[PDB]
Design an enzyme around this catalytic site. Structure first.
Site, PDB file in Angstrom:
ATOM      1  N   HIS B 187      34.910 -27.466 -65.868  1.00  0.00           N
ATOM      2  CA  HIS B 187      34.790 -28.236 -67.099  1.00  0.00           C
ATOM      3  C   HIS B 187      35.909 -27.962 -68.087  1.00  0.00           C
ATOM      4  O   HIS B 187      36.204 -28.792 -68.946  1.00  0.00           O
ATOM      5  CB  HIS B 187      33.431 -27.984 -67.765  1.00  0.00           C
ATOM      6  CG  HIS B 187      32.294 -28.671 -67.074  1.00  0.00           C
ATOM      7  ND1 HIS B 187      31.021 -28.742 -67.599  1.00  0.00           N
ATOM      8  CD2 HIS B 187      32.245 -29.331 -65.893  1.00  0.00           C
ATOM      9  CE1 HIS B 187      30.238 -29.415 -66.774  1.00  0.00           C
ATOM     10  NE2 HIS B 187      30.958 -29.783 -65.730  1.00  0.00           N
ATOM     11  N   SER B 191      37.999 -32.942 -63.946  1.00  0.00           N
ATOM     12  CA  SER B 191      38.315 -33.209 -62.542  1.00  0.00           C
ATOM     13  C   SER B 191      39.727 -33.692 -62.233  1.00  0.00           C
ATOM     14  O   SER B 191      40.410 -34.275 -63.077  1.00  0.00           O
ATOM     15  CB  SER B 191      37.346 -34.242 -61.965  1.00  0.00           C
ATOM     16  OG  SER B 191      36.016 -33.764 -61.966  1.00  0.00           O
ATOM     17  N   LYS B 213      26.662 -43.111 -59.056  1.00  0.00           N
ATOM     18  CA  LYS B 213      27.322 -42.867 -57.774  1.00  0.00           C
ATOM     19  C   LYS B 213      26.701 -41.634 -57.123  1.00  0.00           C
ATOM     20  O   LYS B 213      26.497 -41.605 -55.915  1.00  0.00           O
ATOM     21  CB  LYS B 213      28.847 -42.700 -57.958  1.00  0.00           C
ATOM     22  CG  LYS B 213      29.653 -44.010 -57.948  1.00  0.00           C
ATOM     23  CD  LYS B 213      31.181 -43.767 -57.970  1.00  0.00           C
ATOM     24  CE  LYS B 213      31.753 -43.443 -56.592  1.00  0.00           C
ATOM     25  NZ  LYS B 213      33.243 -43.309 -56.625  1.00  0.00           N
ATOM     26  N   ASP B 214      26.402 -40.619 -57.932  1.00  0.00           N
ATOM     27  CA  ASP B 214      25.803 -39.389 -57.417  1.00  0.00           C
ATOM     28  C   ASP B 214      24.430 -39.650 -56.824  1.00  0.00           C
ATOM     29  O   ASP B 214      24.067 -39.061 -55.800  1.00  0.00           O
ATOM     30  CB  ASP B 214      25.685 -38.317 -58.506  1.00  0.00           C
ATOM     31  CG  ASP B 214      26.975 -37.551 -58.717  1.00  0.00           C
ATOM     32  OD1 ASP B 214      27.997 -37.880 -58.071  1.00  0.00           O
ATOM     33  OD2 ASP B 214      26.971 -36.614 -59.539  1.00  0.00           O
ATOM     34  N   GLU B 257      26.364 -21.076 -34.032  1.00  0.00           N
ATOM     35  CA  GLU B 257      25.859 -22.302 -34.628  1.00  0.00           C
ATOM     36  C   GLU B 257      27.114 -23.168 -34.692  1.00  0.00           C
ATOM     37  O   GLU B 257      28.204 -22.631 -34.837  1.00  0.00           O
ATOM     38  CB  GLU B 257      25.317 -22.033 -36.038  1.00  0.00           C
ATOM     39  CG  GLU B 257      24.179 -21.006 -36.113  1.00  0.00           C
ATOM     40  CD  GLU B 257      24.665 -19.568 -36.163  1.00  0.00           C
ATOM     41  OE1 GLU B 257      25.300 -19.105 -35.191  1.00  0.00           O
ATOM     42  OE2 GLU B 257      24.399 -18.890 -37.175  1.00  0.00           O
TER      43      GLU B 257
HETATM   44  C1  HEM Z   1      27.548 -23.839 -53.163  1.00  0.00           C
HETATM   45  C2  HEM Z   1      28.876 -24.579 -53.047  1.00  0.00           C
HETATM   46  C3  HEM Z   1      29.549 -25.380 -53.975  1.00  0.00           C
HETATM   47  C4  HEM Z   1      29.072 -26.174 -54.979  1.00  0.00           C
HETATM   48  C5  HEM Z   1      27.615 -26.381 -55.423  1.00  0.00           C
HETATM   49  C6  HEM Z   1      30.206 -26.864 -55.567  1.00  0.00           C
HETATM   50  C7  HEM Z   1      30.110 -27.806 -56.584  1.00  0.00           C
HETATM   51  C8  HEM Z   1      31.173 -28.475 -57.183  1.00  0.00           C
HETATM   52  C9  HEM Z   1      30.997 -29.572 -58.144  1.00  0.00           C
HETATM   53  C10 HEM Z   1      29.699 -30.102 -58.668  1.00  0.00           C
HETATM   54  C11 HEM Z   1      32.219 -30.059 -58.380  1.00  0.00           C
HETATM   55  C12 HEM Z   1      32.524 -31.346 -59.105  1.00  0.00           C
HETATM   56  C13 HEM Z   1      32.360 -32.586 -58.243  1.00  0.00           C
HETATM   57  C14 HEM Z   1      33.354 -32.634 -57.112  1.00  0.00           C
HETATM   58  O1  HEM Z   1      34.552 -32.797 -57.405  1.00  0.00           O
HETATM   59  O2  HEM Z   1      32.937 -32.514 -55.939  1.00  0.00           O
HETATM   60  C15 HEM Z   1      33.171 -29.170 -57.703  1.00  0.00           C
HETATM   61  C16 HEM Z   1      34.532 -29.227 -57.805  1.00  0.00           C
HETATM   62  C17 HEM Z   1      35.426 -28.441 -57.121  1.00  0.00           C
HETATM   63  N1  HEM Z   1      35.050 -27.478 -56.203  1.00  0.00           N
HETATM   64 FE1  HEM Z   1      33.248 -26.971 -55.564  1.00  0.00          FE
HETATM   65  N2  HEM Z   1      31.422 -26.438 -55.016  1.00  0.00           N
HETATM   66  C18 HEM Z   1      31.024 -25.540 -54.025  1.00  0.00           C
HETATM   67  C19 HEM Z   1      31.902 -24.889 -53.194  1.00  0.00           C
HETATM   68  C20 HEM Z   1      33.297 -24.979 -53.226  1.00  0.00           C
HETATM   69  C21 HEM Z   1      34.231 -24.482 -52.224  1.00  0.00           C
HETATM   70  C22 HEM Z   1      33.874 -23.866 -50.905  1.00  0.00           C
HETATM   71  C23 HEM Z   1      35.482 -24.758 -52.693  1.00  0.00           C
HETATM   72  C24 HEM Z   1      36.745 -24.429 -52.176  1.00  0.00           C
HETATM   73  C25 HEM Z   1      37.140 -23.179 -51.369  1.00  0.00           C
HETATM   74  C26 HEM Z   1      35.300 -25.504 -53.942  1.00  0.00           C
HETATM   75  C27 HEM Z   1      36.342 -26.024 -54.712  1.00  0.00           C
HETATM   76  C28 HEM Z   1      36.266 -26.943 -55.756  1.00  0.00           C
HETATM   77  C29 HEM Z   1      37.393 -27.475 -56.497  1.00  0.00           C
HETATM   78  C30 HEM Z   1      38.853 -27.029 -56.347  1.00  0.00           C
HETATM   79  C31 HEM Z   1      36.877 -28.460 -57.315  1.00  0.00           C
HETATM   80  C32 HEM Z   1      37.671 -29.476 -58.183  1.00  0.00           C
HETATM   81  C33 HEM Z   1      37.770 -30.788 -57.418  1.00  0.00           C
HETATM   82  C34 HEM Z   1      38.612 -31.831 -58.113  1.00  0.00           C
HETATM   83  O3  HEM Z   1      38.341 -32.137 -59.295  1.00  0.00           O
HETATM   84  O4  HEM Z   1      39.544 -32.355 -57.471  1.00  0.00           O
HETATM   85  N3  HEM Z   1      33.986 -25.764 -54.177  1.00  0.00           N
HETATM   86  N4  HEM Z   1      32.508 -28.231 -56.906  1.00  0.00           N
HETATM   87  C1  LIG Z   2      24.533  -7.664 -44.274  1.00  0.00           C
HETATM   88  C2  LIG Z   2      25.356  -8.890 -44.181  1.00  0.00           C
HETATM   89  C3  LIG Z   2      26.400  -9.101 -43.344  1.00  0.00           C
HETATM   90  C4  LIG Z   2      26.880  -8.081 -42.359  1.00  0.00           C
HETATM   91  C5  LIG Z   2      27.097 -10.386 -43.398  1.00  0.00           C
HETATM   92  C6  LIG Z   2      28.330 -10.635 -42.925  1.00  0.00           C
HETATM   93  C7  LIG Z   2      28.793 -11.976 -42.682  1.00  0.00           C
HETATM   94  C8  LIG Z   2      30.018 -12.257 -42.213  1.00  0.00           C
HETATM   95  C9  LIG Z   2      30.674 -13.615 -42.228  1.00  0.00           C
HETATM   96  O1  LIG Z   2      30.232 -14.457 -43.333  1.00  0.00           O
HETATM   97  C10 LIG Z   2      30.888 -14.178 -44.578  1.00  0.00           C
HETATM   98  C11 LIG Z   2      30.373 -14.389 -40.900  1.00  0.00           C
HETATM   99  C12 LIG Z   2      28.963 -15.002 -40.918  1.00  0.00           C
HETATM  100  C13 LIG Z   2      31.442 -15.505 -40.662  1.00  0.00           C
HETATM  101  O2  LIG Z   2      32.749 -14.866 -40.550  1.00  0.00           O
HETATM  102  C14 LIG Z   2      33.718 -15.314 -41.495  1.00  0.00           C
HETATM  103  C15 LIG Z   2      31.162 -16.368 -39.395  1.00  0.00           C
HETATM  104  C16 LIG Z   2      32.176 -17.532 -39.336  1.00  0.00           C
HETATM  105  C17 LIG Z   2      31.168 -15.524 -38.080  1.00  0.00           C
HETATM  106  C18 LIG Z   2      31.228 -16.452 -36.895  1.00  0.00           C
HETATM  107  C19 LIG Z   2      30.747 -15.928 -35.584  1.00  0.00           C
HETATM  108  O3  LIG Z   2      29.395 -16.273 -35.422  1.00  0.00           O
HETATM  109  C20 LIG Z   2      28.740 -15.906 -34.241  1.00  0.00           C
HETATM  110  C21 LIG Z   2      27.371 -16.300 -34.164  1.00  0.00           C
HETATM  111  O4  LIG Z   2      26.721 -16.978 -35.171  1.00  0.00           O
HETATM  112  C22 LIG Z   2      26.621 -15.969 -32.975  1.00  0.00           C
HETATM  113  O5  LIG Z   2      25.293 -16.391 -32.988  1.00  0.00           O
HETATM  114  C23 LIG Z   2      24.557 -16.431 -31.759  1.00  0.00           C
HETATM  115  C24 LIG Z   2      27.259 -15.264 -31.895  1.00  0.00           C
HETATM  116  C25 LIG Z   2      28.636 -14.876 -31.983  1.00  0.00           C
HETATM  117  O6  LIG Z   2      29.319 -14.188 -30.977  1.00  0.00           O
HETATM  118  C26 LIG Z   2      28.617 -13.842 -29.776  1.00  0.00           C
HETATM  119  C27 LIG Z   2      29.418 -15.184 -33.174  1.00  0.00           C
HETATM  120  C28 LIG Z   2      30.860 -14.807 -33.335  1.00  0.00           C
HETATM  121  O7  LIG Z   2      31.522 -14.189 -32.473  1.00  0.00           O
HETATM  122  C29 LIG Z   2      31.480 -15.233 -34.629  1.00  0.00           C
HETATM  123  C30 LIG Z   2      32.917 -14.884 -34.839  1.00  0.00           C
END
Ligand code: HEM
Ligand SMILES: C/C=C(C)/C=C/C=C/[C@H](OC)[C@@H](C)[C@@H](OC)[C@@H](C)CCc1oc2c(O)c(OC)cc(OC)c2c(=O)c1C
Ligand SMILES: CCCCCCCC/C=C/CCCCCCCC(=O)OC[C@H](COP(=O)(O)OCCN)OC(=O)CCCCCCC/C=C/CCCCCCCC
Ligand SMILES: CCCCCCCC/C=C\CCCCCCCC(=O)OC[C@H](COP(=O)(O)OCCN)OC(=O)CCCCCCC/C=C\CCCCCCCC
Ligand SMILES: CCCCCCCC/C=C\CCCCCCCC(=O)OC[C@H](COP(=O)(O)OCCN)OC(=O)CCCCCCC/C=C\CCCCCCCC
Ligand code: HEC
Ligand code: HEM
Ligand SMILES: CCCCCCC[C@H]1C(=O)O[C@H](C)[C@H](NC(=O)c2cccc(NC=O)c2O)C(=O)O[C@@H](C)[C@@H]1OC(=O)[C@H](C)CC
Ligand SMILES: CCCCCCO[C@@H]1O[C@H](CO)[C@@H](O)[C@H](O)[C@H]1O
Ligand SMILES: CCCCCCO[C@@H]1O[C@H](CO)[C@@H](O)[C@H](O)[C@H]1O
Ligand SMILES: CCCCCCO[C@@H]1O[C@H](CO)[C@@H](O)[C@H](O)[C@H]1O
Ligand SMILES: CCCCCCO[C@@H]1O[C@H](CO)[C@@H](O)[C@H](O)[C@H]1O
Ligand SMILES: CCCCCCO[C@@H]1O[C@H](CO)[C@@H](O)[C@H](O)[C@H]1O
Ligand code: FES
Lengths: 32, 365, 66, 49, 241, 73, 98, 99
Positions: B187, B191, B213-214, B257
């Site tokens: 904010h 955007s 739209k949402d 998954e």
């Molecule tokens: C629980 C997950 C998330 C929620 C609820 C969320 C929610 C939002 C909302 C409501 C907006 C404004 C509407 C839109 O532009 O889509 C927004 C904007 C944005 N979000 Fe997220 N977001 C989440 C995760 C992430 C992730 C994973 C990334 C990137 C690694 C991210 C990056 C951004 C950016 C950069 C904007 C600005 C977009 C623009 O105006 O071009 N968000 N997010």
């Molecule tokens: C106490 C809490 C703890 C330790 C949490 C740690 C979480 C770590 C990460 O999240 C941040 C992690 C989920 C994320 O890594 C970036 C995923 C992409 C990992 C992907 C992932 O999945 C597998 C999976 O789902 C399986 O299921 C049956 C079996 C698997 O191999 C046999 C895998 C596997 O080989 C990998 C690389």
């Protein structure tokens, strides 16, 4: 006339598509 | 209001800007269905799986709440990946704070979904818990100690499932708080838009334009979720988790998954333990580097043809990795997976930054 | 008592694809059986035959079941 | 002069019933609004169900 | 071997999106499980009460439950005892534990069938193909004692001998009990056992589709209505010169 | 960020019609389709190629995997 | 004070007293036929006791040890060649090898 | 002719189809904002309208008639002299901060 009509009409369509397969359709053969 | 009503919004944002709200909806959906599932679930290893079948067989509408939660998790990731993709393509990552919180949100949702998958205690549950927690064993000198500390023992067992229920329960609420901060930072700037050019000269009220739209978007999300829940509830799931956990046997075709497949393929591509775990971590954390790798004089890829081609090559590559992650570790998949893994990092770290510089020279700046 | 499955399988293996596969299977049979020591078996050939035949069976068998 | 400012022609966007500049549009206003109201009432009931 | 044979797609009457299970077939399928599979396979998550209103009346299910004896207690003396089963009881387990199950099946463990159709790729197509797919080993294949050749089982060597054949049982409605008929019915029953919510989700699905068919176009019209103000607006730039 | 404090704009005139005075779907098809075709042709050269590559690698790789497990590829 | 409190909470997540109670396990070799790998649950994980054949034994003897990532001669890993006993846990990330 | 690819790239880029000039598309950092603030009234107002027209076209997923597209040959940097000086001033302050 929504929830009632909608529900009855949809149930009717469902039962028609599945005529003779549902429990309510064969129930009489086993049943005061 | 200062989160809706009179909030100024660009007049030209497209449907790719709808995913932020869909993510909020997915989170609320997960929290609601989740809370209702928690009202019947028990985390003892002897009763976990049974309590889930009890929910689906005897609790009124327990089956729809359960499958909405399972498929809701899938919809959550589809929306996450679209949301991140939009950010990359349009240069939204230049909002550094918003973007970095975004990275934290992605990592937290992954962790949350992982732990949730462990709760029903099926075969995938047990081995996923085994493999993912062991990622920490790659840490020198203290890795093994950290894993056993997390497990609460020398192997995944009772203590593990009980604490995972507790972590899975609370993390989503932490995610909600972090999401609100994500929005507070956004904010401050407002955007971004498809052209990447400041839209201050053409803003329109959030309401009614984007509130409607949402809502339309929300309806479509619900349509997609319920098509899965009512017509194909197991389509995106794994049959192996319908089998209770067996600590003495890992299914021969075990796989993650679907939303974790690309990362799995990257890790599997490296025949070194530490190397694979580092590549895995970097595959996500590299997102935090993107802002530093921006070479273009323009924010969005809208006007950058070369960058666009590389962007779609990156998407096709993630699709390639997803496919490979679902295949056995055999020829020719091993080589394709290694090439795809290398290309992933090559595109982000070298090709895209280079294309930006080339584009700059072509425009004489 | 006659299982429709027997009848349908017989009609289905008349199809060109099945006869071809059956011929490859029988050929494997002669080759493998004529050997005292070998690690080959005719699993591949049999599966090709069953795949072609069962695809056909699946398209009409249920018309004979209640 | 600001008097050189004339609203552009919108005839390609106007609903048929308001295309005649020599006719009052108040005769169709009730129908034009009644439709939108019907659309909103039906949506509300759908969502409520 | 590492070769794979995937099951074909059978035209189950419940295959279609709005197609329910055939309850007479579920009823016959139950008879197959009761008379044949139950001697080796458990079905831990299904109870006699679940059959009521699905394939048997309450009186019929009560009668089915009274056919078995289940342990109960302890009584006033602290002793466990036997009693006629009742609607609330779950189907009897053929073995007290998996160890005994393996001991009675040459080391092989017959899995619980409650979710078998959901726990296997191919679902009933796989189970049906498996049940009706036993054949002699191909030339060159030699199976260790206790194993049978089945082209649909991974590896092709299964520890379950062909469980069904013509007349393995007599159906309550006279339906000819050919092997394929018995398999078709037990697979249908197994579909119900793994997904009892099957018919209801599809009915709800139809209503969801009808409701979305209504609401989506309406909300889209609301969207276009509001946006028309912006979509038809015109701009003019009049800088002083 | 609030209307009134966004930025400086001078000499711009904007004309608009009430939504009730206009059609919500003006020329939906007679123009919608042509513009969709324009937008499609306009991006397909940037979007499609990578996926065609995926498609090729997939079919080649899958068929290669199959052949590799047989007796006589 | 803070160090003590924090370590107590951290300590609470470590293996509880009931989890640390360990003991050996006796296995009947006669029940395991030549060629069979038998898995047992022990101290929480799989325990493999595999009866090896002459061919397997000979194959393992022929391995060029200096080329192994974890160089060990087969005879440094067994007491009696016909018997190989291992903790059935993949050293990568913990799954059970087939 | 590098010049050949250049005109080809210019059109492929396509900001010209929205009637924008290259400098209208620059990503605004603090140097750029200051440069824009230093623009004489006419260039500032022209910039504002071209951007507003483009955003409007973008919202409608439309583009200008071909005869109104900005021409490669006619696109000149109106921002360069101002931006160059803003960067020069900053670099000077940075050198003094280093002493
Ligand atoms: C629980 C997950 C998330 C929620 C609820 C969320 C929610 C939002 C909302 C409501 C907006 C404004 C509407 C839109 O532009 O889509 C927004 C904007 C944005 N979000 Fe997220 N977001 C989440 C995760 C992430 C992730 C994973 C990334 C990137 C690694 C991210 C990056 C951004 C950016 C950069 C904007 C600005 C977009 C623009 O105006 O071009 N968000 N997010
Ligand atoms: C106490 C809490 C703890 C330790 C949490 C740690 C979480 C770590 C990460 O999240 C941040 C992690 C989920 C994320 O890594 C970036 C995923 C992409 C990992 C992907 C992932 O999945 C597998 C999976 O789902 C399986 O299921 C049956 C079996 C698997 O191999 C046999 C895998 C596997 O080989 C990998 C690389
Ligand atoms: C969000 C913040 C949470 C972070 C927690 C930080 C902890 C705050 C520090 C508390 C200061 C209050 C003084 C407490 C003095 C207690 C004396 C003490 O620690 O005795 C030691 C003794 C160990 O004995 P042994 O088993 O024989 O030794 C083993 C060998 N190492 O440990 C204890 O008595 C533990 C009792 C803990 C009580 C404190 C609980 C309060 C927790 C803190 C959170 C709240 C915030 C407080 C604000 C700070 C105020 C200064
Ligand atoms: C994570 C791994 C998950 C597995 C990957 C599966 C990916 C499947 C592909 C689905 C993508 C379908 C969408 C295609 C859209 C086609 C299209 O319209 O392209 C052209 C169009 C032209 O727009 P403008 O340049 O602004 O100009 C407008 C002119 N009127 O471009 C766009 O719409 C850009 C939008 C980009 C968002 C797409 C994101 C797809 C997902 C990618 C994953 C993200 C990456 C990183 C995540 C891993 C960590
Ligand atoms: C949270 C939003 C998700 C909406 C989930 C919709 C749902 O569960 O369906 C409800 C219901 C289906 O009919 P029922 O009367 O409940 O079924 C009984 C048939 N004998 O209505 C809809 O599908 C509404 C459209 C969404
Ligand atoms: C004991 C004499 C049995 C009878 C009666 C039936 N089954 Fe069975 N079944 C048995 C064993 C020992 C096994 C294990 C096989 C192995 O090698 O692992 C099985 C297995 C199955 C399976 C699982 C196959 C798989 O994909 O893993 C299915 C789907 C199956 N059995 C079905 C089934 C049905 C429906 C039966 C009655 C018609 C039936 N079995 C009877 C032992 C015995
Ligand atoms: C970011 C939000 C959330 C995500 C992504 C998520 C994801 C998941 C996943 C992947 C599963 C496994 C589903 C299956 O296949 O069975 C699961 C299970 C579970 N979740 Fe969540 N969850 C979320 C929030 C919650 C919340 C807030 C609670 C509780 C307050 C909760 C309670 C449960 C319960 C009890 C289970 C076990 C029952 C089951 O397996 O369905 N979840 N979750
Ligand atoms: C009290 C009010 C708080 C209301 C909080 C929610 C909020 O701020 O709602 C807004 C409409 C927000 N949406 C936007 O900012 C937004 C901006 C530009 C374009 C679109 N859509 C199309 O172009 C938007 O939808 C959006 O969807 O965020 C949710 C993620 C928030 O929800 C959360 O943070 C929790 C999950 C709670
Ligand atoms: C919405 C379209 C998603 C792609 C449909 C296929 O989806 C796939 O089906 C396989 C077999 O059923 C599953 O094993 C796999 O996990 C699933 O992702
Ligand atoms: C996307 C490019 C497809 C990858 C082609 C892999 O090709 C394979 O590489 C192996 C490497 O050891 C070779 O042994 C094998 O013969 C070859 O077919
Ligand atoms: C599909 C038919 C393949 C033939 C394999 C059967 O094999 C036989 O199974 C018997 C089970 O009681 C064993 O007692 C017997 O020793 C064994 O040779
Ligand atoms: C360097 C390793 C420090 C790890 C933090 C926890 O350390 C542990 O805390 C317990 C509770 O006070 C002690 O009883 C135990 O001896 C101690 O190792
Ligand atoms: C993004 C892919 C880069 C390929 C270089 C494009 O090159 C261009 O192709 C046009 C179409 O034929 C020609 O008319 C033009 O003269 C040529 O420079
Ligand atoms: S190969 Fe990774 S756990 Fe075994």
């Amino acid at each position: 006339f929504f929830e009632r009509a909608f529900d009855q009409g949809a149930d009717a369509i469902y039962e028609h598509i599945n005529e003779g397969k549902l429990w309510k359709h064969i129930k009489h053969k086993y049943e005061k | 209001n200062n989160a809706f009503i009179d909030l100024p919004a660009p007049s030209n944002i497209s449907s790719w800007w709808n995913f932020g709200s869909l993510l909020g909806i997915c989170l609320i959906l997960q929290i609601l269905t989740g809370l209702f599932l928690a009202m019947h679930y028990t985390s003892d290893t002897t009763t976990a799986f049974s309590s889930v079948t009890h929910i689906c067989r005897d609790v009124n509408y327990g089956w729809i709440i359960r499958y909405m939660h399972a498929n809701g998790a899938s919809m959550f990731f589809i929306c996450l990946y679209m949301h991140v993709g939009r950010g990359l393509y349009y240069g939204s990552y230049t909002f550094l704070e918003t973007w970095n919180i975004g990275v934290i949100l992605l990592l937290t949702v992954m962790a949350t979904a992982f732990m949730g998958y462990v709760l029903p205690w099926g075969q995938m549950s047990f081995w996923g818990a085994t493999v993912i927690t062991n990622l920490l064993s790659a840490i020198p000198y203290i890795g093994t100690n950290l894993v056993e500390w997390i497990w609460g023992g020398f192997s995944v067992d009772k203590a593990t499932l009980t604490r995972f229920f507790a972590f899975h329960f609370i993390l989503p609420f932490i995610i909600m708080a972090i999401a609100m901060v994500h929005l507070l930072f956004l904010h401050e700037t407002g955007s971004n838009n498809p052209t990447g050019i400041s839209s201050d000269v053409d803003k329109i009220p959030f309401h009614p334009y984007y509130t409607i739209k949402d809502i339309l978007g929300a309806l479509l999300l619900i349509l997609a979720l319920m098509l899965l829940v009512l017509f194909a509830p197991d389509l995106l799931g794994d049959p192996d988790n319908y089998t209770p956990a067996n600590p003495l046997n890992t299914p021969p075709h075990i796989k993650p998954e679907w939303y974790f497949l690309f990362a799995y393929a990257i890790l599997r591509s490296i025949p070194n333990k530490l190397g694979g775990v580092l590549a895995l971590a970097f595959s996500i954390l590299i997102l935090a580097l993107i802002p530093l790798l921006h070479t273009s004089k323009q924010r969005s890829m809208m006007f950058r043809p070369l960058s666009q081609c590389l962007f779609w090559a990156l998407v096709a590559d993630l699709l390639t990795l997803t496919w490979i992650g679902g295949q056995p570790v055999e020829h020719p998949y091993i080589t394709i997976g290694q090439l795809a893994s290398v290309l992933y990092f090559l595109l982000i770290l070298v090709l895209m930054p280079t294309a930006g510089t080339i584009e700059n020279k072509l425009l004489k700046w | 008592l006659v299982d429709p499955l027997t009848t349908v399988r017989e009609q289905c293996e008349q199809l060109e694809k099945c006869v071809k596969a059956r011929e490859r299977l029988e050929l494997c049979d002669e080759r493998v059986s004529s050997r005292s020591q070998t690690e080959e078996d005719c699993t591949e050939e049999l599966l090709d035959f069953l795949h072609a035949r069962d695809h056909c069976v699946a398209h009409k068998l249920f018309n004979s079941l209640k | 002069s600001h008097t050189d400012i004339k609203v552009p022609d919108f005839s390609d966007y106007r609903r048929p019933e308001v295309l005649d500049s020599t006719k009052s549009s108040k005769e169709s206003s009730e129908a034009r609004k009644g439709f939108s109201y019907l659309v909103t009432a039906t949506t509300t009931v759908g969502v409520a169900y | 071997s590492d070769l794979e044979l995937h099951p074909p797609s059978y035209p189950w009457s419940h295959r279609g999106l709005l197609s329910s299970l055939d309850h007479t077939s579920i009823r016959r399928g139950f008879q197959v499980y009761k008379q044949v599979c139950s001697s080796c396979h458990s079905m831990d998550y299904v109870a006699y009460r679940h059959l009521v209103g699905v394939c048997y009346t309450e009186d019929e299910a009560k009668a089915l439950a009274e056919e078995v004896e289940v342990q109960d207690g302890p009584n006033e003396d602290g002793e466990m005892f036997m009693r006629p089963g009742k609607l609330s009881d779950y189907f009897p387990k053929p073995y007290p534990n998996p160890e005994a199950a393996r001991a009675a099946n040459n080391g092989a463990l017959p899995p619980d069938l409650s979710y078998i159709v959901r726990a296997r790729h191919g679902g009933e197509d796989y189970v049906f193909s498996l049940l009706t797919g036993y054949c002699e080993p191909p030339t060159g294949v030699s199976l260790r004692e206790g194993l049978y050749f089945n082209p649909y089982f991974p590896g092709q060597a299964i520890g379950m001998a062909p469980p069904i054949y013509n007349e393995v049982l007599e159906f309550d409605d006279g339906t000819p009990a050919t092997m394929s008929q018995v398999a078709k019915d037990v697979c249908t029953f197994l579909r119900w056992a793994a997904e009892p919510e099957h018919d209801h989700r599809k009915r709800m699905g139809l209503k969801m589709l009808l409701m979305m068919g209504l609401l989506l176009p309406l909300v889209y019209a609301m969207k276009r209505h509001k946006w028309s103000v912006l979509k038809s607006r015109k701009l003019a730039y009049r800088p002083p010169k | 960020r609030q209307f009134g404090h966004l930025t400086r704009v001078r000499h711009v005139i904007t004309y608009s019609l009430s939504p009730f005075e206009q059609r919500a779907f003006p020329h939906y098809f007679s123009k919608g389709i042509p513009n969709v075709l324009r937008r499609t042709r306009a991006c397909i050269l940037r979007v499609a190629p990578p996926f065609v590559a995926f498609y090729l690698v997939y079919t080649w790789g899958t068929q290669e995997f199959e052949k590799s497990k047989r007796k006589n590829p | 004070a803070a160090k003590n409190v924090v370590s107590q909470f951290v300590s609470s997540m470590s293996a509880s007293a009931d989890v640390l109670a360990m003991s050996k396990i006796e296995i009947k070799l006669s029940d395991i036929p030549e060629g069979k790998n038998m898995a047992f649950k022990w101290r929480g994980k799989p325990l493999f006791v595999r009866h090896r054949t002459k061919k397997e034994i000979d194959q393992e003897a022929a391995v060029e040890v200096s080329q192994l990532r974890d160089p060990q001669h087969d005879l440094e890993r067994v007491k009696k060649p016909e018997w190989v006993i291992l903790i059935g846990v993949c050293t990568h990330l913990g799954c059970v090898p087939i | 002719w590098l010049e050949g690819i250049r005109k080809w790239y210019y059109n492929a880029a396509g900001f010209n189809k929205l009637g924008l000039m290259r400098d209208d598309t620059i990503h605004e950092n603090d140097d750029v904002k200051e440069a824009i603030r230093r623009l004489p009234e006419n260039l500032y107002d022209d910039r504002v309208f071209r951007i507003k027209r483009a955003l409007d076209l973008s919202m409608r997923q439309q583009i200008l008639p071909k005869e109104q597209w900005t021409k490669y040959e006619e696109d000149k940097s109106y921002l360069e002299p101002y931006l160059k000086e803003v960067i020069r001033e900053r670099k000077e302050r940075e050198e003094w901060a280093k002493k």
